[PDB]
Design a protein around this nucleic acid. Structure first.
Lengths: 81, 129, 82, 22, 121, 71, 207, 215, 99
RNA sequence: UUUUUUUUUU
RNA sequence: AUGUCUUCAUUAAUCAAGAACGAAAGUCAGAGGUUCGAAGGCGAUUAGAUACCGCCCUAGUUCUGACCGUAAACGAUGCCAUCUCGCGAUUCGGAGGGUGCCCUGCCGAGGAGCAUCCGGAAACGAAAGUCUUUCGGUUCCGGGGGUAGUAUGGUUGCAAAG
RNA sequence: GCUGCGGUUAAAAAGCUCGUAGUUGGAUCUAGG
């Protein structure tokens, strides 16, 4: 958060679920961060050092919506048709 | 018997937000509901919404942005004077840095910051943050 | 699922949804022109008719009221009026 | 059958009080 | 009574796992082996261990015993695992007359497939 | 639930008054017989004449004779 | 998937599925897997099975050290496939009873620190799924029509209850991971060191 | 100290240098030496030592429960409870538990956003059993208007000005402290408009310094 | 403390259920609450079926059966061990025990 | 089948 | 309840005072009086046994016409409206097919159960949730334990009593 | 306890319904450019 005369005096900016936009707290241990590797359409081999990061919060994972949440994020990013 | 369409709509929005849904359907839509949602959208607490027409009260479909903590109605619509606006905001809103108190004044439905800018009192409708 | 198109429901669901709880209400009843073997006079009839609709000229019963949709007399067919 | 008996006791007492007051 | 304590059972298991070759099905042979293979502070304890070792040998011969790992038996198990037939049972050569139900309505058509071997029952 | 209408002031006030009487402090301070029941008549101290000296057995688990006086 | 024609569902690949009955789901349907169902047994959509499998494969490849991927199963029909999968992929495998405290008890000598967990069935390996939520370890699973998706990140719809399909599904996942690694390629096929890795190397064999 | 976890190994190798990366990635902490290394200004306090008795065939077996609060007065606080047969071991275990439970506390402004944060960002309520504690932002110079028990936790967390409202059986020291702890830790879970900006996910320490881990 | 969700009965959508007289005690118990047992037995004990058959006056006679529906109050059922107390968790099991 | 009691404080 | 492209058009929700109904016992009058059976009387048991057990029974239990208005009258949860989860069963009606039954992840309305967010002191609750993030409407009720539902006054009743 | 309490088990939902006063009452009329 921006404050003071323009400085940022926050200890750290928390992550937010890629699907529900909910903050992921320091003690949220049911939250996950899955990484998908990038590929070349023809060769089919992973591009070293390239990946897509998705973070899902414990609440969404616990409701069992993580499956379609990840699927919809991937469809949005083009990893899946 | 239904007596507060705004209360029903805000409760539905809160429940959908808690469940993490992306859209919410609001039954008996009304002008007051539309203005409340417009204020919330202008402040960025919801996305776009559609007013579905059915030759009756109609419906609304709102897009939730996963950013609203609580949207609550205040009943009865107590009269708020410009002098006690400060007390009401301090009591109802979580902080002075965010959250809005929605009033209906002669000028129209607005938030407490705009009402204080224009030096208007009025009847309180609700609040969101 | 969290992401569901409430604005554009699937047509099959809209069909298999209650008439009042659809996005916009629409009755499941319809008007049908009935053809009875014999007089061959087309007669308009309400699907959920609760009265015994009678041939104007030939005085033959065309529909029998029931708990739901009216029952057509044997030998009489119907076609949905637009 | 412990408070119901107290109710019976008080009813008998009230009957006696009514009779005495008459 | 005649129930062997965990001391005897654990000692017997370790001995069988470490000296399977020397352990025969004869109590006297097992006793003589233990005398030199382990330092046991009591003759009754040594005899109990040797007897349970023989009893375990009798089961090992019949089949694998939980907790005990025997070299030859694990070679046999890994061979049964590595067993790979000459050609796939799922090779298109064998896939000839797959009897499929009406599920092919569009499951195998809208995906862009015209599998020749599928026969609608 | 309590009434919440904008024109329920009379009901709220009357109910509050009705239920204040179910409060021991309020009833004790407003019953009306306080002066005639309290031996001191609402005072803090009172002068009296000693009639006799009595001993009161202390409650359990204590044991003693508290030296009281009748006045 | 992958938005490419080189990684699309191939003819012989789809052929194998109906051979192993890897499309016949149970008669019960879980409302969270109504997506992968095309219209008795609930036959699942083959294309969805393919796309999820590639999605899972990309996730597994992201773990640069293959050891940190832990595959867990207690189904007897998976004991053959699980061992092979770990052998080819260089992962770690847990067979039979999953010792509770595996991922939370740091004192346990069995203690493991997975980066990715793969499950043969959510119900059978419920303990692993539960243990994962205490340490923030994403979970990939093979899910049937009636299986629960609670705390399941990526679910590969398939027929895990089947005898032969279960082994085949593990076989593709190893293949897809290896294809997307450089060890093999689509045209060469599932071959390491000149040995054909055949699907029935994974199938369950009765003693 | 020989770390038994990947997090401990990285922290010992100085690949993770601040508690904030651990908090950002939500990595569980299972060794108190991690906290000892990454926060060198912590101070602890024994709030209460209460004996608890279990009835047996031969009388009552009495063990002591110790509640300890640790904190750095700079946005990091932790609460730990340990029950043991001796007060010394109970205190040691409670200190370890508090270290493991150290958590970040967000600080904000009441009015003008000048200077450093002094109070809580917003009205935050925590609950334990029946004790609910609500922390309300206050202007500068007000101090901490609260009971002695929540006052200690607030001081350790570094909050300077704050009104409180405590309801329930506050005489339960453990529940009072736990409710205060929950309210304090809700601060970095409350979503305010100033956190609406969408950030980009980075590599976890396990994703980045994994060459050492594998080696 | 409420021991059971159904309060020991099987009464839903109902105000009043007529009672039955227990088999042993004769106590009045609501029919939904009483322990009911349908017993079908041979008219003759198992140890005498051979004797009756060998004494039969007919070449082939089918021995009849006794059908009895028994109603027990809770007390006279527990005492007779027709039903037994269960642990807190096992109380919620509703499947009949193996016979 | 029958089977009633157990001073005060600690 | 369901069906309804029928009609009216706010006529509604909750309700001080007020009113109907209201188990069993009980009261009055007239009939019946099999069974069971308070009270009562005997036989047992017992230290005693005005009880449990057994036997004989009176009021009553039954019908008709009036009274009483209380029950653990309990789901110990007021009523109306609204939102939040999955599963498969069940009662009624409807829609669509197959041969009364089967199928439709069918539609409403009930009565439940086990997958249950949140809540709760907990037991536990799909409501007892959507509440310190308090605020849809409305009625009744509670304010440490007793004294005590007692005294007195009023009112209802033939009485018992409310 | 209006802000601001509680009523399954701790004190507390009237046995149930009808009903006057009181309290509370669906949507809808000039938005735009």
């Amino acid at each position: 958060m921006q404050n003071d005369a323009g400085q940022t005096v926050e200890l750290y900016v928390p992550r937010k679920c890629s699907s529900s936009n909910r903050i992921i707290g320091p003690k949220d241990h049911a939250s996950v961060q899955i990484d998908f590797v990038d590929v070349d359409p023809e060769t089919g081999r992973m591009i070293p050092g390239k990946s897509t990061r998705y973070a899902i919060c414990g609440a969404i994972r616990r409701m069992g919506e993580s499956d379609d949440a990840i699927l919809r994020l991937a469809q949005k990013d083009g990893l899946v048709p | 018997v239904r007596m507060n369409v705004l209360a029903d709509a805000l409760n539905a929005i809160n429940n959908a937000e808690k469940r993490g849904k992306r859209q919410v359907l609001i039954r008996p839509a009304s002008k007051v509901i539309v203005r409340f949602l417009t204020v919330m959208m202008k402040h960025g607490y919801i996305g776009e919404f559609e007013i579905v027409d059915d030759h009756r009260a109609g419906k609304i479909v709102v897009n939730l942005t996963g950013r609203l903590n609580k949207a609550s109605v205040i009943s009865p619509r107590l009269n708020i004077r410009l002098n006690d606006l400060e007390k009401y905001t301090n009591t109802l809103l979580p902080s002075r840095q965010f959250g809005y108190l929605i009033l209906t004044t002669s000028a129209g439905i607005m938030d407490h910051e705009e009402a204080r800018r224009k030096h208007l009192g009025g009847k309180i409708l609700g609040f969101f943050f | 699922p969290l992401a569901v198109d409430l604005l554009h429901p699937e047509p099959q669901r809209e069909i298999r949804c209650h008439k009042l709880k659809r996005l916009v209400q629409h009755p499941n009843s319809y008007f049908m022109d009935v053809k009875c073997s014999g007089c061959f006079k087309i007669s308009t009839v309400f699907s959920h008719a609760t009265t015994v609709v009678v041939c104007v000229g030939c005085n033959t019963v065309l529909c029998q009221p029931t708990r739901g949709k009216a029952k057509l007399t044997e030998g009489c067919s119907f076609r949905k009026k637009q | 059958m412990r408070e119901k008996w107290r109710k019976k006791r008080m009813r008998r007492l009230k009957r006696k009080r009514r009779a005495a007051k008459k | 009574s005649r129930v062997r304590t965990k001391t005897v059972k654990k000692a017997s298991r370790v001995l069988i796992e470490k000296y399977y070759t020397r352990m025969t099905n004869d109590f006297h042979n097992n006793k003589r082996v233990c005398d030199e293979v382990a330092i046991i502070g009591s003759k009754p304890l040594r005899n109990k261990i040797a007897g349970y070792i023989t009893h375990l040998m009798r089961r090992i011969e019949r089949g694998p015993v939980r907790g005990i790992s025997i070299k030859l038996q694990e070679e046999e198990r890994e061979r049964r695992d590595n067993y790979m037939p000459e050609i796939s049972t799922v090779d298109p050569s064998q896939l000839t007359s797959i009897k499929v139900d009406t599920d092919t309505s569009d499951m195998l058509k809208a995906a862009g497939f015209n599998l020749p071997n599928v026969t609608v029952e | 639930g309590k009434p919440k209408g904008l024109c329920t002031a009379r009901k709220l006030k009357t109910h509050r008054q009705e239920q204040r009487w179910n409060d021991k402090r309020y009833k004790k301070a407003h019953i009306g017989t306080r002066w005639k029941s309290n031996p001191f008549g609402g005072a803090s101290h009172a002068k009296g004449i000693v009639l006799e000296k009595i001993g009161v057995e202390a409650k359990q688990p204590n044991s003693a004779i508290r030296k009281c006086v009748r006045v | 998937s992958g938005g490419a024609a080189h990684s699309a569902l191939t003819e012989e690949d789809v052929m194998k599925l109906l051979a192993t009955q890897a499309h016949l789901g149970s008669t019960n349907l879980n409302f969270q897997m109504q997506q992968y169902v095309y219209k008795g047994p609930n036959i699942i959509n083959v294309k969805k099975t393919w796309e999820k499998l590639l999605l899972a494969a990309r996730a597994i490849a992201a773990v640069e050290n293959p050891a940190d991927v832990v595959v867990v199963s207690a189904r007897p029909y998976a004991q053959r496939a699980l061992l092979k999968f770990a052998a080819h992929t260089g992962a770690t495998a847990i067979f039979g009873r999953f010792s509770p405290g595996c991922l939370t008890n740091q004192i346990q000598k069995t203690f493991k620190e997975p980066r990715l967990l793969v499950i043969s069935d959510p119900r059978i390996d419920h303990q692993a799924v539960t243990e994962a939520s205490y340490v923030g370890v994403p979970v990939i699973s093979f899910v049937n029509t009636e299986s629960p998706l609670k705390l399941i990140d990526i679910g590969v719809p398939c027929n895990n209850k089947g005898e032969r399909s279960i082994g085949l599904m593990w076989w593709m996942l190893a293949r897809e991971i290896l294809i997307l690694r450089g060890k093999i390629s689509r045209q060469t096929g599932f071959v390491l060191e000149g040995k054909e890795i055949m699907p029935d190397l994974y199938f369950y064999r009765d003693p | 100290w020989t770390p038994v976890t990947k997090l401990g190994r990285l922290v010992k190798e100085k690949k993770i240098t601040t508690l904030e990366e651990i908090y950002l990635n939500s990595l569980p902490i299972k060794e108190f030496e991690i906290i000892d290394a990454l926060c060198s200004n912590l101070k602890d306090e024994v709030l209460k030592i209460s004996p608890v008795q279990k009835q047996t065939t031969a009388g009552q077996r009495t063990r002591f429960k110790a509640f300890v609060a640790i904190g750095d007065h700079a946005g990091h606080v932790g609460l730990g409870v340990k029950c043991s047969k001796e007060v010394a071991t109970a205190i040691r275990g409670a200190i370890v538990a508090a270290k493991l439970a150290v958590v970040p506390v967000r600080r904000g402004y009441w009015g003008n956003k000048i200077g450093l944060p002094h109070t809580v960002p917003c009205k935050v309520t925590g609950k334990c059993a029946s004790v609910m504690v609500r922390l309300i932002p206050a202007p500068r110079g007000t101090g901490i208007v609260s009971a002695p028990v929540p006052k200690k936790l607030l001081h350790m967390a570094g909050i300077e000005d704050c009104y409180t409202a405590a309801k329930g059986s506050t005489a339960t020291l453990g529940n009072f402290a736990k409710a205060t702890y929950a309210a304090l830790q809700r601060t970095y879970s409350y979503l305010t408009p100033d956190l609406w900006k969408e950030e980009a996910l980075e590599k976890s320490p396990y994703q980045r310094h994994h060459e050492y881990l594998a080696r | 403390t409420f021991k059971r969700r159904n309060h020991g009965r099987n009464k839903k959508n109902r105000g009043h259920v007529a009672f039955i007289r227990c088999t042993n005690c004769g106590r009045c118990c609501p029919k939904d609450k009483a322990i009911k047992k349908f017993v079908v037995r041979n008219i003759v004990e198992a140890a005498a079926v051979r004797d009756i058959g060998d004494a039969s006056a007919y070449t082939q006679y089918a021995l009849p059966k006794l059908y009895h529906k028994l109603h027990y109050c809770i007390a006279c059922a527990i005492h007779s061990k027709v039903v037994r107390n269960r642990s807190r968790e096992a109380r919620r099991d509703r499947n009949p025990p193996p016979r």
